[model samples]
Target chain A: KTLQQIDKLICSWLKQIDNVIPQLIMEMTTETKRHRFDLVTNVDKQIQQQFQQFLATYFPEHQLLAEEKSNAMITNEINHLWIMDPIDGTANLVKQQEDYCIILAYFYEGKPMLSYVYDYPHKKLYKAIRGEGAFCNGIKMEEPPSLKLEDAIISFNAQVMNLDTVQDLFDASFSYRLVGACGLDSMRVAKGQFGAHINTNPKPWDIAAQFLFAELLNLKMTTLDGKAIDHLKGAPFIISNKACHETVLKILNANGGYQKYR
Target chain B: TLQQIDKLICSWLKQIDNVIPQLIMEMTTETKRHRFDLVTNVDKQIQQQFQQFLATYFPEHQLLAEEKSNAMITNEINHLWIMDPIDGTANLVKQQEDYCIILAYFYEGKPMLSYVYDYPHKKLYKAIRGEGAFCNGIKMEEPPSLKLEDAIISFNAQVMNLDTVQDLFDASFSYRLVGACGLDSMRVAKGQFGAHINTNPKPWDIAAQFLFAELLNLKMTTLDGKAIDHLKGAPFIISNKACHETVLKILNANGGYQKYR
Candidate 1:
């Protein structure tokens, strides 16, 4: 299939999943709210199933790996494979009800071909294709302004990471943000509302699309080690636009470089 | 005589009520989000405006305020007014939607009256020991029951990094580090949660809140289980009596230490 054909199909798939995931999240409201800390949920599985069906009808030959069902054995066979995170931030879905996201990505021979991360609460969609620029909602994203460590706004998880370690970052930067959702955290910085997002624990499906989307916009995505991140295992994902990427990497590199992730 | 003092305070408070909102609104519009966390020109101006008003009318009374420092008063004074021109300046500047004005009064070193004006919603809360606490002229009551299981607690990320607080989170009810420590702590006093924990809060952050919690008979303590003194910083926990023991157990288990007296 042509790239244009794939982009259009992916966009359509995102919209359908975006609309369907929320209903599934709402229907499985009890599980979402009750198991606030864990991300696993029936909605995650159901939405992934529905998304795979959508992809199957249009591109039956394409391979698929989803958050709810993918196992360690799944291999890259077909040239076109779909990676979908049916629900991200299930805790926020139950607690805040507005910060979770539904994300999807299309891979061409193990490389991200196109990616979409839809923030359900704020009703914002971020899309990018390889060699093409990224867009939030409908506006094409421009390069983020250069940010000093002290002047940058840092976003990260709210639990465990507190003011002391954070103050080193906060005092060096302009401020810190805990928006309650990892997907929303990445989406905000990608949209220019924030400078960077540091997520300590993310599954493969949590960041595969965003990592690709950010890279397309010349943004930085890395594991704490400064090594290329494994798209299958989400570990210490740090995403920053061009302006603050190196500065943040240096800071993280000095802080033991994802030793905690292991 | 006491009623006459109430009348006098009333006039100063009315003038404050009139001018403070306009200043906050103007500040919120002009300040950029990143630079807003620090003290702003707007904050300095509003505090000065209020200070001048007090200086002009009550020249003999002493004023201890934030934004600018004042030397300790050693001699006996019948009245001393403590003010935090803007308690949640960071939140105000960032447009986080939850900053407030905090003013407190002390008569002979005892809390005489206190007020916290939540800016965005235009709600003013006031308390005078015998007169009772009021929000916008109506009496305010203690917050309803808070269940530990259902409570939404807030602590700054700074506290958790300390070995003491790290263990506390591990042992206590689930918690979040919502920015703006003062505002989050007060959320609990307002009955939104069972307790709120804040570490390294400056005097300006807790002066008005100290008085507010006192009136509600809420238990406020340092992480070390000591009485709260304005001079120190450490694990600060504010909650009702019912929740204090359980909270302390969690804090104790997590090695949470109180840094202040």
Candidate 2:
């Protein structure tokens, strides 16, 4: 299918997943013994299954990979792959009841073709088409030629960054947001809420959807080693608006000055 | 009329200021300065102010004061004064957020009035025990009834760090560390969630707040199954009907651990 047709298809599927998953999680809270610190929830399984079944009917030839089902289906030759983290940040969903997301991505020839990351709290949808500008909730993003690091907000893992080491690095920036969801972190940067998002070792399913969204918005996505990230594999990296990218690179290049036990 | 009101108000205000100096003088932080340690300053000030206000304005009134100030005022007085100062000291001194004021009163030793002032946010939450809570001049009602799963649990990070409390902290609730323990507990009192779990609270931190939660029909208890004493450090839990029993079970299973002290 064309990018336009696929975008529309994914949008509808996302709405279905968003409406059902929250209610499912809410119902499970009453089941006291049904606890999984790391196991994917049934709601995740159901959402991924439904999406996979839908895709199977329309695009039988395309590759499909989902967080819950990706283990069974791993292939490199496929021209197109569907990546989904049925519910990213499941613990946040269980704890904060906010900062979680439904992430979906499409890849063609191992490059991000299109991406969508939906933040359920604000009911905001971030969408991007390769080479096309990004849009959130239907408004096209206006990419600034330069981003002022001091005026920009950044989100990252404080524990990993050894917050103290980065505090000075961030002193030059406007604000630091430390909410713990990887997908939402990247989505926030794509939607222009913050200038950048730095995460350590994010899986492909974690960022594939928002990865394309960042690309479409013209935000720079690179590993801490300063190489373009591979969407099929997890990498410790930084995602930022073009202007702030080099500044972040300089800080990450220093390896956070050898902070210990952080 | 103005002169009489001024005298009465001044007398009460003077009573309030009398205790602050001693409180600030006695406070100390082990390492760098700890914001929470300053609660002693505000605690002494609030108690002195409320005590004087009660003694001068209603000489015959009864007050269930904290252990320190209670000696001067017996609990048998019909009108009681309640106060808490600098709630969320860790946040105040550390993150510079999440601290608040908790104030309230009882008539015939029954809950009659309360107020909580969130310092950095400048949000003042007030309530008369029978009346509803208010935020910044607006009537604030509790959230709609929801299951524990649907609810957002505010976790006490200090408590979660302990080994025994870890299981209950992790398994029972989806948690967010919003910084202030008192305000987060009050959020449950206002029905924003099913419950709030916290540990290591000071006497001056939650005296007035207990009345507010009781008024909202929230179940509250110290971690060690003792009544909250404002004169000492105590850990506690607050929850509404929906999740109260389950949370208590989790707490009980965790052995109500006292690792911090």
- Top-DockQ structure, candidate number: 1
| lDDT of candidate model 1 versus the reference | 0.67
Compare the candidates by lDDT and give the number of the best one.
1
Please compute the TM-score of chain B alone for each predicted structure, in the order given. Answer: 0.79, 0.68
Residue lDDT tens for model 2, A80-156 = 78888877877666554556777888877777778777877668787777756677788887664456566576766
Q: If chain B of candidate 1 is superposed on the true chain B, what is its TM-score?
A: 0.79
Q: In candidate 2, how many Å is residue A248 off?
A: 3.2
* DockQ, all models: 0.13, 0.06
What are the lDDT scores of the predictions, listed in order?
0.67, 0.63
At residue B24, what lDDT does model 2 achieve? 45
Looking at model 1 chain B, which ten-residue stretch has the lowest summed lDDT? B28-37
Question: Which portions of model 2 miss their true places by more than 4 Å?
Answer: A29-36, A72-76, A144-149, A161-173, A255-262, B1-261
Which residue pairs show backbone clashes in model 2? A95-B174, A95-B175, B16-B49, B62-B77, B62-B78, B203-B230
Which is the leading candidate under TM-score? Answer: 1
